[PDB]
Design a protein around this ligand. Structure first.
Ligand SMILES: [Mg+2]
Ligand SMILES: [Mg+2]
Ligand SMILES: [Mg+2]
Ligand SMILES: [Mg+2]
Ligand SMILES: [Mg+2]
Ligand SMILES: [Mg+2]
Ligand SMILES: [Mg+2]
Ligand SMILES: [Mg+2]
Ligand SMILES: [Mg+2]
Length: 224
RNA sequence: GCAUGGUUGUCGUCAGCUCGUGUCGUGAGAUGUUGGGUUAAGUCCCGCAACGAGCGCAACCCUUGAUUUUAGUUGCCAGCAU
């Protein structure tokens, strides 16, 4: 239920190129400007409503969602929305096998929390060099890749991606695992493998925040 | 010793040889173990559909180079003379 004035004032309608686009996205097209394709805003507001209603149904029983923002233009936007809405996200590289190999990756998560109590209850250092360096250097890398996904317990119930052309592993890893997928698609992205596509621009920083925070408002609406 | 246990040599103290769970391939198989740097070394980092681990490397062991305590003879001789 976003008015076109907000979408237009962000920069959502912009596209990538006339040379770099997916023919499957033809129906979500409105006029060719000077070298750029433009999304039909009338379609976007209709599309965003279905995703607006759907992702509170998945969160109707205090469910769980995932936010994928590895792109450099949406690292904080997913973090800002997930933290504010009390959910989960990923910002650094998507480690292959996060979902299909959830059994193995979870063993890595408990290892990072294992060292957490070392500086919380146990001895600060075991050796002057090994514990101070080898044990501590692991935490910086281990908590950079996993980070704010450590509080999950089981497989997610819905997935949020911003650029399915870049985040391809996540997409393929969710279809094999049969998880509903919602996300924003550019002019060169492929809508066939997504469930609840949202035609919009994602390179424009002022355009990502409009949708990513709006989606965060639907899940926050029912968990009360 | 071109039938064998053994016991050995040289490549070589070179840095390699693999496994589990995932993923790609109809399939034998592949990835991890390739790419950019770095190191004595798949040593270590960064980047990637991989995430980890085992035998190898390094470490544990012996000897030399500084030092504390302990025990002072058959070793040592400053304080004392002989
Ligand atoms: Mg023989
Ligand atoms: Mg002979
Ligand atoms: Mg020789
Ligand atoms: Mg197969
Ligand atoms: Mg090899
Ligand atoms: Mg060597
Ligand atoms: Mg050794
Ligand atoms: Mg020594
Ligand atoms: Mg002494």
């Amino acid at each position: 239920v976003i008015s076109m004035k907000q979408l237009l004032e962000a920069g959502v309608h912009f596209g990538h190129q006339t040379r770099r686009w997916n023919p499957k996205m033809k129906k979500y097209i409105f006029t060719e400007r000077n070298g750029i394709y433009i999304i039909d805003l009338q379609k976007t507001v209709k599309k965003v409503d279905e995703a607006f209603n759907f992702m509170r149904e998945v969160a109707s029983d205090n469910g769980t969602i995932l936010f994928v923002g590895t792109k450099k233009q949406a690292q904080e936007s997913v973090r800002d929305e997930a933290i504010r809405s009390g959910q989960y996200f990923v910002n650094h590289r998507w480690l292959g096998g996060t979902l299909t190999n959830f059994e193995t990756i979870q063993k890595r998560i408990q290892h990072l929390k294992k060292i957490e109590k070392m500086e919380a209850d146990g001895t600060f250092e075991v050796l002057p060099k090994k514990e101070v360096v080898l044990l501590k250097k692991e935490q910086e890398k281990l908590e950079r890749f996993l980070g704010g996904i450590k509080d999950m317990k089981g497989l997610p119930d819905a997935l949020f991606i911003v650029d399915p052309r870049k985040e391809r592993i996540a997409v393929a890893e969710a279809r094999k695992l049969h998880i509903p997928i919602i996300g924003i698609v550019d002019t060169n992205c492929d809508p066939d493998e997504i469930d609840y596509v949202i035609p919009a621009n994602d390179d424009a920083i002022r355009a990502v925040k409009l949708l990513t925070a709006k989606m965060a408002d639907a899940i926050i609406e029912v968990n009360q």
